[PDB]
Amino acid sequence: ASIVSLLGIKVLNNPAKFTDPYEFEITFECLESLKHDLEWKLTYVGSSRSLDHDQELDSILVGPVPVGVNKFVFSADPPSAELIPASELVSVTVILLSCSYDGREFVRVGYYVNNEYDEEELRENPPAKVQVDHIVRNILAEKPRVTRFNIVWDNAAKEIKLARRLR
């Protein structure tokens, strides 16, 4: 309608280790009282090749939703490196942060995440076995990709396809 609108997002604690939590300070406006909570979720894209390697990192229910301008910190566990193809682990991928209301997604914010080793020795000559504790993750927070979707609230009345995951 839209009863809730994203106003701003700050990626906290960035860069970070691959194994550190994700932290976002999210600012949203709510215009009317709602029956239901907001569900915020974060999805890590394991492979640019299929939805088959996505991992839902966490989700958090926010509510009852107060009318006005709201701020909260969303934190989420890192993905399991075990379940990401070894060859795609230390590369660019995307994260998608979305908010749904009663199951209906009304906003998505996508970010590219660059993954690179912390030591010069490993960057040019990476091993076959991946050193997860040595991955530094950088979310490209200056480049958010925001897609809003129109929903009913309470009343009825690689880089090619990474870019595609973002939209």
Author numbering: 1 to 157, 165 to 174
Sentences from the paper on this structure:
The global fold of Asf1N in the current structure is nearly identical to that solved previously without the histone helix. The only significant changes in the structure are a forward rotation of the loop connecting β-strands c and c', as well as a small rotation of the loop and α-helix connecting β-strands e and f. Leu130 makes van der Waals contacts to Asf1 amino acids Val94, Tyr112, Arg145, and Leu96. A lone salt bridge is formed between the invariant residues Asp54 on Asf1 and Arg129 on H3.
The histone H3/H4 chaperone Asf1 (anti-silencing function 1) is required for the establishment and maintenance of proper chromatin structure, as well as for genome stability in eukaryotes. Asf1 alone adopts a switched-type immunoglobulin-like (Ig-like) fold containing two extra, short β-strands (termed h and h').
